[PDB]
Amino acid sequence: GPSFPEPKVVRSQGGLLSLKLSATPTPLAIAGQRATLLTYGGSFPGPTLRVRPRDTVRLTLENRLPEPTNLHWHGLPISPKVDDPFLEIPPGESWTYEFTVPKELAGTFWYHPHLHGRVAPQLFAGLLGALVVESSLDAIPELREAEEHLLVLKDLALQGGRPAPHTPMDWMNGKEGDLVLVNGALRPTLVAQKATLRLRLLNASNARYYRLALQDHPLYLIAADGGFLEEPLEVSELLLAPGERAEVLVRLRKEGRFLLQALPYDRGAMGMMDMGGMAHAMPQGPSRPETLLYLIAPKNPKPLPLPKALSPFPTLPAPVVTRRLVLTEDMMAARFFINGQVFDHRRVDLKGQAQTVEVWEVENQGDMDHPFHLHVHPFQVLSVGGRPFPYRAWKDVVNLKAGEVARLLVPLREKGRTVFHCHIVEHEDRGMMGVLEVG
Amino acid sequence: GPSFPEPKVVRSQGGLLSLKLSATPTPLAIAGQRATLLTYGGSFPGPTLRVRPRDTVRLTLENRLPEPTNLHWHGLPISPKVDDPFLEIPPGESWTYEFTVPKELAGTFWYHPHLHGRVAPQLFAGLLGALVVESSLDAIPELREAEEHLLVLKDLALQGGRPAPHTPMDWMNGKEGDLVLVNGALRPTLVAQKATLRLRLLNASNARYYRLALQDHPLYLIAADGGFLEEPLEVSELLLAPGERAEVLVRLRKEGRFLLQALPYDRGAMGMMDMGGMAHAMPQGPSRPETLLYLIAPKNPKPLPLPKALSPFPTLPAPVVTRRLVLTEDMMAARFFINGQVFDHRRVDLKGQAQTVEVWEVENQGDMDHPFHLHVHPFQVLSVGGRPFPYRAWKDVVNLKAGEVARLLVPLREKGRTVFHCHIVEHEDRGMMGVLEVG
Ligand SMILES: [Cu+2]
Ligand SMILES: [Cu+2]
Numbered sequence: 001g002p003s004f005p006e007p008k009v010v011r012s013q014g015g016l017l018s019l020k021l022s023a024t025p026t027p028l029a030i031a032g033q034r035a036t037l038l039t040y041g042g043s044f045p046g047p048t049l050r051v052r053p054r055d056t057v058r059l060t061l062e063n064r065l066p067e068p069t070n071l072h073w074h075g076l077p078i079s080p081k082v083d084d085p086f087l088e089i090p091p092g093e094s095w096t097y098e099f100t101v102p103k104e105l106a107g108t109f110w111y112h113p114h115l116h117g118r119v120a121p122q123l124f125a126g127l128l129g130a131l132v133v134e135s136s137l138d139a140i141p142e143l144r145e146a147e148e149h150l151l152v153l154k155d156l157a158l159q160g161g162r163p164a165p166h167t168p169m170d171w172m173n174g175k176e177g178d179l180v181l182v183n184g185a186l187r188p189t190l191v192a193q194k195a196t197l198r199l200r201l202l203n204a205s206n207a208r209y210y211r212l213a214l215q216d217h218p219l220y221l222i223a224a225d226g227g228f229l230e231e232p233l234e235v236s237e238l239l240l241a242p243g244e245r246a247e248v249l250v251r252l253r254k255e256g257r258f259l260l261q262a263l264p265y266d267r268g269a270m271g272m273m274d275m276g277g278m279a280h281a282m283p284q285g286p287s288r289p290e291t292l293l294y295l296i297a298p299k300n301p302k303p304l305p306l307p308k309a310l311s312p313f314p315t316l317p318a319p320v321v322t323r324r325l326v327l328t329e330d331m332m333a334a335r336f337f338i339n340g341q342v343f344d345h346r347r348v349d350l351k352g353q354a355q356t357v358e359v360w361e362v363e364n365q366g367d368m369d370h371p372f373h374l375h376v377h378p379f380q381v382l383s384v385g386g387r388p389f390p391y392r393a394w395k396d397v398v399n400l401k402a403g404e405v406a407r408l409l410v411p412l413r414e415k416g417r418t419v420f421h422c423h424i425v426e427h428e429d430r431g432m433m434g435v436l437e438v439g
Numbered sequence: 440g441p442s443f444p445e446p447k448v449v450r451s452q453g454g455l456l457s458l459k460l461s462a463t464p465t466p467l468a469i470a471g472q473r474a475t476l477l478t479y480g481g482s483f484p485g486p487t488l489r490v491r492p493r494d495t496v497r498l499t500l501e502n503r504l505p506e507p508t509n510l511h512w513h514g515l516p517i518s519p520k521v522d523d524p525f526l527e528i529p530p531g532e533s534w535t536y537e538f539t540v541p542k543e544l545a546g547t548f549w550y551h552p553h554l555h556g557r558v559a560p561q562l563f564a565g566l567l568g569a570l571v572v573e574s575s576l577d578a579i580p581e582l583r584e585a586e587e588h589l590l591v592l593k594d595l596a597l598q599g600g601r602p603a604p605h606t607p608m609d610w611m612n613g614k615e616g617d618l619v620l621v622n623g624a625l626r627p628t629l630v631a632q633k634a635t636l637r638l639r640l641l642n643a644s645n646a647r648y649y650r651l652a653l654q655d656h657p658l659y660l661i662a663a664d665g666g667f668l669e670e671p672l673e674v675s676e677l678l679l680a681p682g683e684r685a686e687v688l689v690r691l692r693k694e695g696r697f698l699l700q701a702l703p704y705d706r707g708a709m710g711m712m713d714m715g716g717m718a719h720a721m722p723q724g725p726s727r728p729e730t731l732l733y734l735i736a737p738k739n740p741k742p743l744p745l746p747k748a749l750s751p752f753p754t755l756p757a758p759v760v761t762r763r764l765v766l767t768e769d770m771m772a773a774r775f776f777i778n779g780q781v782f783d784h785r786r787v788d789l790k791g792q793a794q795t796v797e798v799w800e801v802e803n804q805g806d807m808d809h810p811f812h813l814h815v816h817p818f819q820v821l822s823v824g825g826r827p828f829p830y831r832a833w834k835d836v837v838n839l840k841a842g843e844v845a846r847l848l849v850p851l852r853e854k855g856r857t858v859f860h861c862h863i864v865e866h867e868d869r870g871m872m873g874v875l876e877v878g
């Protein structure tokens with residue numbers, strides 16, 4: 001096979017992507033071992049769905065798990081009557097998701113379960129896949145001539161040939177695994193054939209963060225979670241929190257082997273210690289550095305010039321309301337709150353008007369990083385921690401370190417009831433989620 | 440008696456104004472004739488209550504009318520659990536209103552009935568009186584040395600020795616009367632003894648407007664509905680819509696007689712005509728000019744200098760929501776709407792958070808002037824008809840001509856359910872009112 005493993009791609013045909021996917025326990029070879037994972041389409045990751053704006057997607061999910069499940073079309077600005085976070089597909093039953101891809105949309109999105117209280121074990125076990133929305137911008141020479149790859153960043157831990165069970169501490173921190181994988185492979189080698197790479201990045205992990213750095217190279221950010229930037233932005237490193245996506249250009253500078261690493265990062269996970277009276281919580285501190293993949297540059301690399309522009313960001317109407325959403329923790333109880341409450345599917349927390357813009361101030365009063373996600377309505381991050389964001393682009397997850405406030409500009413799109421929640425999915429399952437109704 | 444009639448004053452004593460007032464049909468002499476009016480305290484207008492900040496008011500209203508009634512403490516930023524627009528005092532029964540006058544408050548306020556559907560006939564018949572909040576600012580020499588008077592502007596029509604009944608056309612336009620009175624007197628004479636007058640003005644009419652102009656003189660506006668301006672503002676004339684108050688300084692320029700007039704003003708009242716097929720609505724056009732009072736200046740008048748400053752207007756917190764409230768009419772039905780609905784006491788229309796500031800955009804899509812009033816929460820008018828307001832002061836009624844939008848800055852104060860409505864009281868009775876809940 002190709003030196004670099006990537007999920008199989010399913011493309012729309014004549015403007016229609018019609019596909020039946022089963023969610024099923026699947027024996028497979030993983031990182032050199034045999035294991036049974038929970039998969040979509042018999043693979044880990046699940047297949048990459050590749051579509052264009054205005055395509056129709058018709059996805060019939062068959063549930064062959066011993067528990068109920070459903071799908072969240074993460075990042076897609078479609079109707080919550082389709083992307084329905086309250087729907088339950090019982091074991092043995094099927095459901096068809098049908099929607100049209102929005103006209104003004106591009107980038108890397110993904111699908112995974114969202115059945116409250118069951119998300120963390122289902123996602124950890126292997127249920128996720130990517131969805132790419134191809135754009136006319138992809139035809140510009142500086143992108144067309146680049147070598148494109150998808151990198152699905154997901155870790156895993158195995159026990160007795162199955163995903164390791166969640167411990168109480170896992171419910172508190174979010175579960176991370178020792179197998180730090182790219183596209184389900186352990187430290188694959190990417191032998192580049194072109195001097196410019198276009199990499200679509202997805203953090204599909206439950207809780208692990210990826211502080212991305214390529215040895216000896218900067219990255220050029222060209223897209224965030226939900227669309228292009230207005231122009232490329234040079235960065236020395238790039239933090240991807242759970243649920244986030246990015247697209248970067250890599251401009252290979254000379255021949256050789258360069259490691260793509262997840263550098264040490266302290267997200268505030270906790271351990272427990274007993275030192276003589278003690279028996280209390282202690283910081284785990286920064287993650288150990290991980291090598292994600294080996295990048296081999298071609299001979300005499302001569303990278304393309306960067307595109308001068310990408311996509312102009314929409315001029316939004318003035319906002320008509322400001323919201324404040326405060327995140328707090330009860331670590332020893334593994335309970336997590338928004339404005340002092342846990343999720344209740346029957347309770348509407350915010351009520352907004354479609355086609356107006358809101359300002360959401362999300363404040364992390366906990367000690368852990370929390371990556372805040374809103375369904376259905378992509379947002380523009382204005383600032384985090386009082387620092388203005390250095391680009392304009394659509395996002396749907398925003399990471400908050402301890403104490404930080406994120407200010408978001410949130411245009412409300414499709415009508416209906418939807419949710420916002422922490423994308424450390426253990427925290428969502430344990431209560432850190434609320435209901436937004438748009439009318 | 441004094442050449443210039445003014446309502447009797449009741450003052451707080453030792454920080455307490457404790458008073459029993461009966462609402463009662465009362466035979467009295469009015470404009471030279473005998474009539475029976477509905478009065479508070481046996482007089483028309485009712486007695487002027489004069490208090491200071493932090494005083495306690497204990498007002499027991501005895502209802503001696505054949506129908507239920509209640510009181511609205513118009514303009515007072517107190518609790519809607521006291522200023523309760525839903526309370527009904529049955530015939531023969533009594534209710535005690537008790538509250539403390541807010542610390543930061545000054546100006547001319549008033550009291551009148553607010554029992555939905557019964558306001559117009561009760562107010563028209565004579566049920567109203569003034570409440571003055573004295574301020575330390577009153578001690579500055581430029582105000583202290585002025586000659587102060589209250590002018591209650593209220594019109595009346597009599598039939599068979601009683602207030603004229605409402606016709607269907609009255610319910611559509613709001614009722615105006617042919618007796619255009621000041622303090623219940625017909626064109627009284629004010630023989631000034633000082634060169635500077637301080638006049639507190641109250642429009643307590645159901646629907647009549649007063650486009651005020653004093654012959655040969657400007658007016659110096661020093662207070663709006665609910666408090667002082669920041670400095671005096673010179674004006675050539677001053678429009679007082681129903682429910683509005685103002686305080687002005689008059690600087691008498693030479694000896695002589697000067698008429699205070701209500702100049703012609705077209706508020707969009709309608710009539711009906713039949714010209715050969717016709718049988719349709721026609722504009723009444725501008726009101727006929729009225730003389731309100733005769734002002735006699737003293738000999739060799741030498742007016743005080745104007746105060747350089749009055750009261751600095753509070754710096755308000757940035758607003759957290761913008762509301763839009765659209766007023767419309769069905770004239771032939773005498774039905775009046777806010778955002779397409781009529782009042783329903785069981786339905787909450789707006790829900791806001793105490794101690795936040797809101798921007799209210801009130802838009803008149805009707806053809807009549809509508810003076811918009813909000814209980815409990817005084818506002819700062821930013822602009823009307825796209826014209827910035829030329830001063831900062833607290834108001835609680837804002838007049839909108841046909842097509843105009845008023846932009847208001849509304850700090851929400853006391854918690855509870857209250858109302859906003861047109862202060863052409865016929866329109867309120869006929870549905871032009873909504874419910875605000877503050878929590
Ligand atoms: Cu997600
Ligand atoms: Cu979290």
Ligand SMILES: [Cu+2]
Binds near residue numbers: 072373421
């Ligand atoms: Cu979600």
Ligand SMILES: [Cu+2]
Binds near residue numbers: 511513551682862
């Ligand atoms: Cu009033």
Ligand SMILES: [Cu+2]
Binds near residue numbers: 775810862863867871
């Ligand atoms: Cu009106």
Ligand SMILES: [Cu+2]
Binds near residue numbers: 858860
């Ligand atoms: Cu009222």
Ligand SMILES: [O-]
Binds near residue numbers: 072074114373423
């Ligand atoms: O999610």
Ligand SMILES: [O-]
Binds near residue numbers: 511513553812862
């Ligand atoms: O009123």
